Amino acid sequence: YNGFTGRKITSQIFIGPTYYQRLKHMVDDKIHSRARGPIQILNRQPMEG
Amino acid sequence: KNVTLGVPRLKELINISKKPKTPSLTVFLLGQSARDAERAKDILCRLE
Amino acid sequence: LDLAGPLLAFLFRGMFKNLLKEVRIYAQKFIDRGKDFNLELAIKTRIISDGLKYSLATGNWGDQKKAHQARAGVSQVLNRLTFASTLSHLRRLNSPIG
Amino acid sequence: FIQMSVQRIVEDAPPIDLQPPRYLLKFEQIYLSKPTHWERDGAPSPMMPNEARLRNLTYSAPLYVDITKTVIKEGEEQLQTQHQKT
Amino acid sequence: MNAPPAFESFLLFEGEKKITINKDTKVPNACLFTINKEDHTLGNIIKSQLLKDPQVLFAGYKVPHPLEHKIIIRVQTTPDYSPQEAFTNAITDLISELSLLEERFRVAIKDKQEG
Amino acid sequence: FIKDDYGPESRGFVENSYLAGLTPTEFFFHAMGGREGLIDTAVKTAETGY
Amino acid sequence: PVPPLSVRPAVVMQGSARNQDDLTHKLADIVKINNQLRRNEQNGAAAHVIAEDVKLLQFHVATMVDNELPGLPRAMQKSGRPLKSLKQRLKGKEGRVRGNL
DNA sequence: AAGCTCAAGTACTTAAGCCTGGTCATTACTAGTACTGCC
RNA sequence: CAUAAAGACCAGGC
DNA sequence: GGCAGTACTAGTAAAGTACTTGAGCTT
Numbered sequence: 001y002n003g004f005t006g007r008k009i010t011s012q013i014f015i016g017p018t019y020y021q022r023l024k025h026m027v028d029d030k031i032h033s034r035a036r037g038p039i040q041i042l043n044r045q046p047m048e049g
Numbered sequence: 050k051n052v053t054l055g056v057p058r059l060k061e062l063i064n065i066s067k068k069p070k071t072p073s074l075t076v077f078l079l080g081q082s083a084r085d086a087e088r089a090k091d092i093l094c095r096l097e
Numbered sequence: 098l099d100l101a102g103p104l105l106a107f108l109f110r111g112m113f114k115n116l117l118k119e120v121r122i123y124a125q126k127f128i129d130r131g132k133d134f135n136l137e138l139a140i141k142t143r144i145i146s147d148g149l150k151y152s153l154a155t156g157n158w159g160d161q162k163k164a165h166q167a168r169a170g171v172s173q174v175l176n177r178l179t180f181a182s183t184l185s186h187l188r189r190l191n192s193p194i195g
Numbered sequence: 196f197i198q199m200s201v202q203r204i205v206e207d208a209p210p211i212d213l214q215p216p217r218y219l220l221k222f223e224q225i226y227l228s229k230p231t232h233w234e235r236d237g238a239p240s241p242m243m244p245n246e247a248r249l250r251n252l253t254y255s256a257p258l259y260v261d262i263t264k265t266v267i268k269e270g271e272e273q274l275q276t277q278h279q280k281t
Numbered sequence: 282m283n284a285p286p287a288f289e290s291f292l293l294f295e296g297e298k299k300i301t302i303n304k305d306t307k308v309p310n311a312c313l314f315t316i317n318k319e320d321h322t323l324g325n326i327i328k329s330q331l332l333k334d335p336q337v338l339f340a341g342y343k344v345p346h347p348l349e350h351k352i353i354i355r356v357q358t359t360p361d362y363s364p365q366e367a368f369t370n371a372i373t374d375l376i377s378e379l380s381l382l383e384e385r386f387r388v389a390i391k392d393k394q395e396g
Numbered sequence: 397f398i399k400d401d402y403g404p405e406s407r408g409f410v411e412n413s414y415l416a417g418l419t420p421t422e423f424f425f426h427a428m429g430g431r432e433g434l435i436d437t438a439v440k441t442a443e444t445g446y
Numbered sequence: 447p448v449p450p451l452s453v454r455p456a457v458v459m460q461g462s463a464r465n466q467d468d469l470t471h472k473l474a475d476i477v478k479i480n481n482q483l484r485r486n487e488q489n490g491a492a493a494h495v496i497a498e499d500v501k502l503l504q505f506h507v508a509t510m511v512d513n514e515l516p517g518l519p520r521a522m523q524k525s526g527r528p529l530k531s532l533k534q535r536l537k538g539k540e541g542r543v544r545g546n547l
Numbered sequence: 548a549a550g551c552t553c554a555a556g557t558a559c560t561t562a563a564g565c566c567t568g569g570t571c572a573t574t575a576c577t578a579g580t581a582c583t584g585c586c
Numbered sequence: 587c588a589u590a591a592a593g594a595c596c597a598g599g600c
Numbered sequence: 601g602g603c604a605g606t607a608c609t610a611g612t613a614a615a616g617t618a619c620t621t622g623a624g625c626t627t
Contacts, residue, residue, distance in 0.1 A: 004321040024178060028282060041455055043546050056443050102196035110204050117208065124213055134218055136262055136278060150253055155571065156595065164526050173596055445563035457591045525573055
């Protein structure tokens, strides 16, 4: 049954338990934002990493 | 017969390499040698 | 396949030969007087200890002054993410080809 | 590696020839003991690997080799002193 | 770190009106309602109730995006009948139904126990 | 397999389908068939970018 | 030429001591053997020793420019790490041209 | 004898793009100076 | 508002 | 009291290309 309107979903969806693994990769550690921060010593360019 | 294709052949073309991996020469026949396989066989013997 | 035994043997021979080498250097240099000779001052344990500990620590495999010629990639840090990842990292092969 | 190869590397090494008196050095046999730490005071203690991790120690064993030493003084008597647990 | 607190869903902070009303110039006699801090719970009700009224030509709702809590309901009625009146009448009818459903459900409860 | 077997099974023709599932030898031959794809994917990118 | 401190900045560790770039030490060598060659020109020495010092001076002066020369031993500052020559600075990927420009 | 080109021999070169973590060691030898012990 | 060096290798991601 | 020895602390060592080069053959 549809969640929002409660109407039946015409096609019959395939349901079953399957074993799922969370992965080490998570967006909180992959997010980065840069405005005029620290600067490299030799190149006078923004830092790496 | 096989021909190098894709990225390696593109390397042979862009590099203008001296010796390609698969050099090939196609040959066409003017006269009755074209339609008849006999004289064609004769040219086949004369080109090899 | 090179496991701990053959690898640590290949590593132990040359280091042991440096131990004997400095036993020869300090030995003879202390002998030229003809006074006497003392063993316990002729053996530097920093050779074996610091050498094994070093080449296990960094992973560069060989003499550290020869590290350019020395093969690298042996003895990575073990992966603790999952017990499966650890069992996998403990059972592995590494081809020397570049 | 321990139970075989190390004795082969210690044994298969050539005896030390030196020199007029002569000085020869030979390695009899090699002995390991359970991993032990020698502290700042020099007090040995058995290390469990947990305290080895927590303190950044290195989990390792002391290595001892008997060393027989022969001196040749030309007086027909070559005196050999054998040292245990070098 | 960017996760919104558990309520962006219903609680209104300073300045946000619950309902805002904008007339629609594409069609005569059509209006557009914007319901802040609601979701399909209410909108499906109201839409299904507005489709009974024979004077309502168009009734629809949408959430422009789920991560925002908002509802947009377009209503088009027949001439000389304001769509706001259709929406009010819809709500009043809905209450008139739900109260009756409560009472009959209570009668059913008291009957199922020693009845 | 027996030496000098050129038959369809020995040389890697896969009779089964993913629904029914592979036999073991067809599974290993299948892994060999995929390894070439992975290797091509990894190797081509550098030459193409260069 | 000796490039400015901006081209070869020092390395400030904790404020206790200042390390130095590959250049600074290389130029240090060049100044050492240059001074030795000056002195041995004033004395005159045995005159083949001059040739030796001009060959080693050749090694340092020509090495600072190119450390990757084949057939020659590649200068080793310390820690078994070869020097970074100006060519190595300006050449490969992450070199100034391709990397910083 | 000079010179000409043509063959092998030799040296030398570059090898994807961006990004994330960690570990590690910055050297080990030789010489000089200072301190302690013994005569 | 300044300091945490640089480099090296290894693991991984698309 | 002075001299010698030892220890510690501070300087200090895959393929593919072009290029070149040596030999081989001719006016």
